[PDB]
Amino acid sequence: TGETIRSQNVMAAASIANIVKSSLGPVGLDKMLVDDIGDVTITNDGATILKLLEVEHPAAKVLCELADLQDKEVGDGTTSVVIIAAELLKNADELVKQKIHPTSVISGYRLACKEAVRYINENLIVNTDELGRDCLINAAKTSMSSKIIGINGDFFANMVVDAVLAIKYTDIRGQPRYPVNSVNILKAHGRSQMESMLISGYALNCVVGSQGMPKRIVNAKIACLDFSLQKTKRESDITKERIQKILATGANVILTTGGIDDMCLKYFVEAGAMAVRRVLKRDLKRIAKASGATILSTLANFEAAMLGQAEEVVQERICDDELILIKNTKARTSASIILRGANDFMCDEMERSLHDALCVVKRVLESKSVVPGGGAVEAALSIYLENYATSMGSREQLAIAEFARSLLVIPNTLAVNAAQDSTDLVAKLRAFHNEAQVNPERKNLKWIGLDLSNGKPRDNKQAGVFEPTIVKVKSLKFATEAAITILRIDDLIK
Amino acid sequence: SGRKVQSGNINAAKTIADIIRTCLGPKSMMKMLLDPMGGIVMTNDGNAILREIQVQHPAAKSMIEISRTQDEEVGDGTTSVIILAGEMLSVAEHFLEQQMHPTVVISAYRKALDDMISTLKKISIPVDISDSDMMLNIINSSITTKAISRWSSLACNIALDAVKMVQFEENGRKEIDIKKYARVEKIPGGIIEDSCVLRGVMINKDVTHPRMRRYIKNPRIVLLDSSLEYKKGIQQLCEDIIQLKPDVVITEKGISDLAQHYLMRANITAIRRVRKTDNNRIARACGARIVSRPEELREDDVGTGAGLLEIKKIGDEYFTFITDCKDPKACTILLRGASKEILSEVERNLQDAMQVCRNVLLDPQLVPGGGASEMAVAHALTEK
Amino acid sequence: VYRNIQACKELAQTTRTAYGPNGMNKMVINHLEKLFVTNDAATILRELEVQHPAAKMIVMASHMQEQEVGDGTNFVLVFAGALLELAEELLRIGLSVSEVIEGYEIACRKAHEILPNLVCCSAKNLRDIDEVSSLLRTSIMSKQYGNEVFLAKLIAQACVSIFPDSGHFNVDNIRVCKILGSGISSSSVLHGMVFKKETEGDVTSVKDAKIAVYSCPFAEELMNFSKGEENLMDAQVKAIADTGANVVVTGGKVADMALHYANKYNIMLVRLNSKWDLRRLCKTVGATALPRLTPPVLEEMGHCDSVYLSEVGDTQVVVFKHEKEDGAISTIVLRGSTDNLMDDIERAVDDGVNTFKVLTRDKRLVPGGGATEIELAKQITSYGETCPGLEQYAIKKFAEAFEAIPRALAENSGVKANEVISKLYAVHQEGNKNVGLDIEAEVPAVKDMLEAGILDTYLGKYWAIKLATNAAVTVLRVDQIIM
Amino acid sequence: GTDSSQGIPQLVSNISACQVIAEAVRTTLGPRGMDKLIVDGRGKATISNDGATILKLLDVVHPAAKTLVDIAKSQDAEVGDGTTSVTLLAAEFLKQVKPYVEEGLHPQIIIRAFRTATQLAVNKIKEIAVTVKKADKVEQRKLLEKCAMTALSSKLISQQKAFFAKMVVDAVMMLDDLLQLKMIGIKKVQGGALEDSQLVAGVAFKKTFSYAGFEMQPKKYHNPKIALLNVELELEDYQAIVDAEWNILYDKLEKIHHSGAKVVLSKLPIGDVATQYFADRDMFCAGRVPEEDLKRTMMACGGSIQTSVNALSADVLGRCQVFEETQIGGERYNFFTGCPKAKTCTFILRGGAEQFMEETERSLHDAIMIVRRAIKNDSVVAGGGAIEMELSKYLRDYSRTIPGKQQLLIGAYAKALEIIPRQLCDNAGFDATNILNKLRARHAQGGTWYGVDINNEDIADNFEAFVWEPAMVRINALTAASEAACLIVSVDETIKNPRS
Ligand SMILES: Nc1ncnc2c1ncn2[C@@H]1O[C@H](COP(=O)(O)OP(=O)(O)O)[C@@H](O)[C@H]1O
Ligand SMILES: Nc1ncnc2c1ncn2[C@@H]1O[C@H](COP(=O)(O)OP(=O)(O)O)[C@@H](O)[C@H]1O
Ligand SMILES: Nc1ncnc2c1ncn2[C@@H]1O[C@H](COP(=O)(O)OP(=O)(O)O)[C@@H](O)[C@H]1O
Ligand SMILES: Nc1ncnc2c1ncn2[C@@H]1O[C@H](COP(=O)(O)OP(=O)(O)O)[C@@H](O)[C@H]1O
């Protein structure tokens, strides 16, 4: 029947957590989400589950609202914040069952969070410096592991780390902001993936734009167009007049996206232009922004010094074709990655691995403050806060202790979802982090993550699993806020 | 719940698999359909069994949907797919009760699938391509045990000529094939021997009054979605069409006699009340282009298509023959008979053999049926 | 038939957990409302009110195994349970019961000849107390706790190696006596039957003595009646004290007048005779029970050798040693906090001494701890493919039935059963026969028993396999009966 | 029942049963805990404070309850101090481990973890226990009595407690032969004050109508020995019965000088209406005597036992030192002191207020128990739930080191060790959680000998508060509690055999 609306709220939060509990981690099980119309949805990430779960309890409403606003704040962490909040609510309910007033519990939780963010800020990792590459390459390999391309994963990691760090695009106020769309895929037929090499520029596999293109160009101007140069019955017949007019302004390499022209062979020698059809919109937009250019449809009237610059266009046998290597642009955006093999059909999994490795590497490089993943932070915080609570001495000892104990739910669920003996894994992690405090010389034993592959404790900074500091800190803040808000709503009788 | 939901899902899978588990093979047993009015249906096909029956569990609905998607993609084998899925999900019960995680079961299943793929590709017997001998052997093997045994002599050569009418040469050697672009012409009447083949698109629509230059020795088709009106006071579109000088321009609106004269002034033949499933195949077989924006209008607005046009009113009905098309990828196949109750089935089995042929172009391989392949791969796994 | 298999499954499950050294002991209450805590499976089956006639067959098979080898009973139970489970699933497949029976018989015949090919026999002889005690370690290790095994093995072996004469042993010779109080470590080995007594007028140096056995335990007119009672009692004590009688026992209590008259004859008065002690005395000295006081005779009287008081164990005890064989009887004194753990230790001692008796007629030792079970399973399942026909299914199920013993021995030790079985089976191809299941590690690890000295007798395993297979077969050949 | 089957459900049921049995003695922990009323059927309600007495008279029927009660009783019999502690601690162990059982933690793992934790705790205790025995306890006993009056500190008897403590320990020292509670018995007398309460080295029993017949006995008699008579003393064939009765009455006087016994004892009623008839006998008599007085006389003075009417023996008037009969509170009491083996000390519970029997029997008995236990052993640790806190802290610190299943279980063991101070401060009536939190803080950082103070309800250094408990008895109690918990955990089935 029930006895306390506090209990009803905590059970509602626990049920909401249990709905999304099993999906935490990269190997989380899927969930079926069916509505009244009979439609079905398949999902793995908890954010999608919560964003469309049909909730019914006001406490569940509050918890989902906090999760959604946390998602809008930073993104990843909704499932983790919900699970942590539910664990805090359960433990606080157990405490208040022992005649501890919830206000002392709330103050203890606030103190525990305030101390936890301080502990994290003093025991995080900033190894993503210019001297930190072994960690980055190991992260790329680990994200590229558990696949048939693992043997070739070392070369791919080496070729991708320097590719992303060399193309680092600076921003307006001075931060390294690598654009993910700067890196482009480029399929290849013939030789397998075990011979891939980085290309510093884009080269569409298509018809040859021109044959008079020199290997290196001292001065080029990207005169991008969209129309096809053809004769009809500033010029009515768009073949000569506007081309020469733009060439007078300085247009050296005209980027003709449209169809080819029947007398442009002379123009491709006297001026050095190009003609390639069906250029990808994203690729052309990036190559224009790689040189500070914008797409021009017509030439009726910007043409003086706004057109982008090309420094070197290699015209040789690349990918068994006469590719156009428009590289060495102005901005750090022009690049392309060879995708060897036979086609894009049998290499779909490896190219998707390339994308996810790119995503994890760009996550690591951004937000230079990073923390190890795999639940290391949770165990370290639990060990810290157990000592902190005893050092306190007030009536918030139990509150802070239960906050410390509740954080272990994240590695616990990570271990369960990894099909391992969860208690043993969390105990091993906790024991490794114990020596990080009792032993003053074993300082560099703090980032022992959870290796989900073999299900054994593992040094994780070396492994390369990483999480932005802001994500963990702000998720902890929101978990504490949600737990506090639900725990305050208690004095009801029904 | 935990594993309770897994057990429920696979129990629904099992209870839907054994419904049609009995209706495969050359001696399939019949099934009873009892609608809530009193009617009763004889049925041998498990596909219709699943289609007519109603289910409430999402797992069953998903499996039925996957069986369908396999049906309209590759053709046959839906009953086998359902049976196999039910069997694997049923034998997973033993391990799911071992308190051992579904993830390791999943990994084991994936390894087993990879090994089965390898051992099938190892055990498959090769077959020749473009050779009628083992093509007819496959006709005897699979295209038989259907309603075609009386009309196999015609189905066989219809398919064998039809194998070379839908090829796309995009990335390799004739490895691309599209399914609906074959110009099917199913018309009852006359003898079944009148069914034949033709290289070109066969359009059942025609101009109301063909008193104009309909056929030209080099149809340069231009597609247009605009509607032809009386005149400008629209002849302006016709005047712009005159700029590139085509001979045939395909529209999708009616044409009047005065509109007919205005069109033949430009010497262009339009069509009306045609279907999109006809317009797309016309464009595919002719390689034409559709454009009406004046700025985009260039010399590319006209694309040469066929090389010979003809109109024949076979049995006082308006046919249109477009032979010798530029792209032999959407070409005419003719069907004749009395009733469409079997010719549809014979047709569908023939394009099943068509898919057989294109895969033979990819992997000219055959696997021994009658449970031979199943036990062979089971032995391969067990010894592995 | 599935009803019978289900009943046998339940009865095997109820004692499956007690298997192995980490067996979960159960609480036992009998009809007279005691409260035991026992891990011995045979004891559990004794107090189980088994009524299903199908499970009665397996219970009788277990009794026969215990009656002949004295150990491996729970092995018989669990093996029969696994065999019936797999036979049930075979029946559900569609195989006839006759084919299953034939396959089981063929598999048992194969196993009986495979078994003697994996033996690492005894070292030299039953002598060399340390070595032979090391052999006798595993049984006591399993039956009671694994801690005090190092001492229980020595206690139970020093007594049994006393008389290895002509290679003949009897279980009843090695008797066990209860002396409550101090811990188990205070126990030792003594010679001759022992129990309590009351009086102190005893003589130590005694020749062949004379035992009297009592099957039935004990104003002037008032003075004359008292005198009559006194004179009748004096006449009775004179009549029982004639013919040079020296020792008397009675199942009752002491009386001051009775003990006074006994002492005036220089005869001690022994009391506190248990309901089981009189038969043991009568068989050990060839005596007889005398109902009343008035019929004592020399012929109906048994003979002992030496009687004296021993203070060993912080208490007074009597000793009846040096019998006709002068060394046949050999007791063991036991010390414990209460009597509840006394019974567990006596059953462990019995389950050790009977294994020693089995070893007397067979020096063959087999690697235990699941080593031999997994080896037999591998051998039989390899032989299965060599036999085409309908019996291959039953042979494979026999192999999987052998697979059950390490499975139980692990799952009743807090270890994932499938993991350890897979690891054992994989190692057993290269890390051959002598490898088994390690108990110490919580992680599912394996360990060699030839080095660890965890071994069990060949004859016991052979007979247990035979009896379990026979029980499964004879319970599969029953259709039904109205119940 | 409710899920009494294989494995987990039966373990849960047994844990619940142990919780129920511990709840019956939960609140009696501490020197000033609650009190219970038990009615024994016919209507003799029993009131008592000590936990062991409560457990000994329960009606346990559940097998888990019985197998915890027997452990408690064995602990009480082996050492008389600390019974409700072991049951409460074992029940706390079971309740703390229960939320780990349904998750699949195999109970053998719990057994192993409990055993290793208990071994660690027993090892740790030895490095903290401190020997104080030689530090002026036998000679210069001021420390002994300074520990002794703690059972009566901050009470109404605060001023006079030193007298009672010093005098009872004076009695204890001269009787240092492994004293027992039964053979050191106290008696209550109506009237008087508390300051003048005294101890006679013997017995103190009032003479009632059926107890003693003749008054003004020869007190200053230096060889009084008890004579245990077993026959009545007080007073066609219609005249034959009269003659027989008169002959019996005349023969009852044959023991006056022929037997020669100054004090005669009988189990048959004695008539004080015939005091002048007994005045002709002119000797002391005893009748309807309690068994305690009988045993104290036998092992102190050694009175003879007689069965016949003219039973003559040489022990009727053996050697006993002195005879005492002094009126106490206006009523004459019999004192059989002055004995060759007078290892007896009966205390006169003088006092005007009659309801103080519970106060004195809860105070002085505990005081003498503490004195005796401090004398017997050499090394002690701080009490009042102080050593439990230290063990909990040490076990919690050690648990984090070990990897694996045992870590959580040892942590739960350490958490369960906290219940003793919590229950002490709960029975004292003050906010338990605040006391526990302050204790944990100041005890993890500051010192290792802080417990709970029952007077001011605050943390205190029980070492300088002279709250001593022997290390050996605490170690034994902890071992017994852990072993009882392990025995409960290791059981997963019961067999009934109801009728046939
Ligand atoms: N390689 C890895 N090894 C272990 N844990 C990982 C790894 N990659 C990601 N994780 C886990 O994923 C969790 C965050 O993902 P999650 O919060 O589920 O995403 P979302 O918030 O989108 O649901 C982190 O707790 C981290 O421990
Ligand atoms: N003549 C035959 N003898 C034995 N087996 C056959 C024969 N004809 C067909 N089969 C078997 O029938 C199976 C496929 O039939 P089924 O799946 O029911 O048809 P569909 O694929 O149209 O559903 C194949 O596995 C094949 O082995
Ligand atoms: N230390 C050990 N490690 C592993 N297995 C053991 C160990 N000790 C005994 N065993 C196994 O446990 C089994 C115990 O048999 P047991 O239950 O005593 O049969 P019964 O009760 O009928 O005598 C033995 O067969 C032995 O192989
Ligand atoms: N004056 C006191 N101050 C603090 N604690 C005390 C005091 N007297 C007794 N205790 C506590 O009481 C406990 C024993 O009480 P209890 O178990 O009720 O009696 P018993 O041990 O005889 O069963 C000890 O652990 C001790 O710490």
DSSP string, A384-401: HHHHHHHHH-STTHHHHH
| 8 A C-beta contact, residue A353 and residue A149 | yes
Helix then strand count (H, E) for chain D reads 16, 18
Asked if D497 lies within 8 A of C30 by C-beta distance, the reply is yes
Q: In 10 A of CB A191, how many CB atoms?
A: 14
| Cα–Cα dist D348/D368, whole Å | 16
| Cα–Cα dist D300/D339, whole Å | 6
| Cα–Cα dist A72/A66, whole Å | 10
| 8 A C-beta contact, residue C270 and residue C247 | yes
Helix ranges (DSSP H) in chain B:
3-17, 46-52, 58-74, 78-96, 102-123, 132-138, 152-162, 235-244, 257-265, 276-286, 340-362, 372-383
Using CA atoms, how far residue C106 sits from C102, C109, C376, in Å, is: 6, 5, 14
DSSP per-residue letters across B211-266: -S----SS--EEE------S----HHHHHHHHHH--SEEE-SS---HHHHHHHHHT
Q: Which chain A residues are closer than 8 Å to B61 by Cβ? A: 38, 40
Residues of B annotated as catalytic are: 45, 78-79, 352
| 8 A C-beta contact, residue D347 and residue D186 | yes
User: Binding site annotation covers B79?
Assistant: yes
Helix (H) or strand (E) holding A355: helix A348-365
Asked if A383 lies within 8 A of D441 by C-beta distance, the reply is no
Resolution (A): 3.4
Q: Which 8-state DSSP code applies to residue A441?
A: S
D74 touches chain C (CB under 8 A): yes
Backbone angles phi, psi at C85, to 5 degrees: -60, -50
Q: Is D84 an annotated catalytic residue?
A: yes
How would you label D14-46 residue by residue, b for 16+ Cβ within 10 Å and e otherwise?
Answer: bbbbbbebbebbbbbbbbebeebeeeeeeeeee
| 8 A C-beta contact, residue D272 and residue D213 | yes
| 8 A C-beta contact, residue C174 and residue C353 | yes
Closest-CA distance, D480 to chain A, in angstroms, reads 28
Partner residue opposite C25 with nearest CB, options D7, D105, D491: D491
Using CA atoms, how far residue C291 sits from C183, C211, C276, in Å, is: 39, 14, 16
| Cα–Cα dist A427/C82, whole Å | 36
Q: Which residue has the tokens 């007979």?
A: C463
Q: Which chain C residues are closer than 8 Å to D6 by Cβ? A: 13-14, 17
Asked if A40 lies within 8 A of B62 by C-beta distance, the reply is yes
| 8 A C-beta contact, residue C344 and residue C360 | no
For residue B260, which of B205, B207, B322, B217 has the smallest C-alpha distance? B207
| 8 A C-beta contact, residue B196 and residue B208 | no
For residue C192, which of C374, C373, C59, C326 has the smallest C-alpha distance? C326
| Cα–Cα dist D15/C110, whole Å | 49
Strand A312-314, strand A274-275: pairing: unpaired
Within C128-272, strands assigned E span 174-180, 188-189, 193-195, 211-214, 247-250, 268-270
Among protein residues, the one with the nearest Cα to ligand 1's atom 6 is: A374
Asked if D445 lies within 8 A of A383 by C-beta distance, the reply is no
Asked if C49 lies within 8 A of D500 by C-beta distance, the reply is yes
For residue A328, which of A247, A258, A224, A253 has the smallest C-alpha distance? A253
Tokens of A469: 């500091």
CA–centroid distance, residue A26 to ligand 1 (Å): 6
Helix ranges (DSSP H) in A76-223:
78-96, 102-122, 134-143, 153-166
| Cα–Cα dist A380/A390, whole Å | 16
D404 touches chain A (CB under 8 A): yes
**Chains contacting chain A through 3 or more C-beta pairs under 8 A:** B, D
| Cα–Cα dist D318/D314, whole Å | 7
Q: Which 8-state DSSP code applies to residue D431?
A: -
For residue D22, which of D413, D415, D420 has the smallest C-alpha distance? D420
How would you label D294-322 residue by residue, b for 16+ Cβ within 10 Å and e otherwise?
Answer: bebbeebbbbbebeebebeeeebbbebeb
Q: Which chain B residues are closer than 8 Å to A40 by Cβ? A: 58, 61-62
- Using DSSP's 3-state secondary structure scheme, residue C336 falls into strand
Asked if D444 lies within 8 A of A383 by C-beta distance, the reply is no
- Using DSSP's 3-state secondary structure scheme, residue A210 falls into coil
Using CA atoms, how far residue D334 sits from D286, D328, D338, in Å, is: 10, 10, 12
Q: In 10 A of CB B156, how many CB atoms?
A: 20
Using CA atoms, how far residue A426 sits from A87, A462, B104, C11, D151, in Å, is: 16, 20, 21, 39, 48
Using CA atoms, how far residue D136 sits from D132, D143, D164, in Å, is: 8, 6, 20
Partner residue opposite A390 with nearest CB, options D401, D402, D444: D444
For residue C142, which of C207, C206, C71 has the smallest C-alpha distance? C71
Strand B125-126, strand C330-336: pairing: unpaired
D105 touches chain A (CB under 8 A): yes
Partner residue opposite C48 with nearest CB, options D490, D495, D500: D495
| 8 A C-beta contact, residue A234 and residue B306 | no
Interface test with A, best of D98, D103, D401, D437 (most A CBs within 10 A): D437
Query: Which ligand minimizes its atom distance to the CA of A145?
Result: 1
Burial grade of C199 (CB within 10 A; 0-12, 13-18, 19 or more): middle
DSSP per-residue letters across A287-345: HHHTTT-----------SS-SB---EEE-SEETTEE--EEES-SSTT--EEEE-SS-SS
Q: In 10 A of CB A267, how many CB atoms?
A: 22
Closest-CA distance, C3 to chain D, in angstroms, reads 20
Experimental technique: cryo-EM
Closest B-chain CA to A419: B101
User: Binding site annotation covers A46?
Assistant: no
| Cα–Cα dist B272/B256, whole Å | 11
Backbone angles phi, psi at B302, to 5 degrees: -115, 125
| Cα–Cα dist A197/A339, whole Å | 9
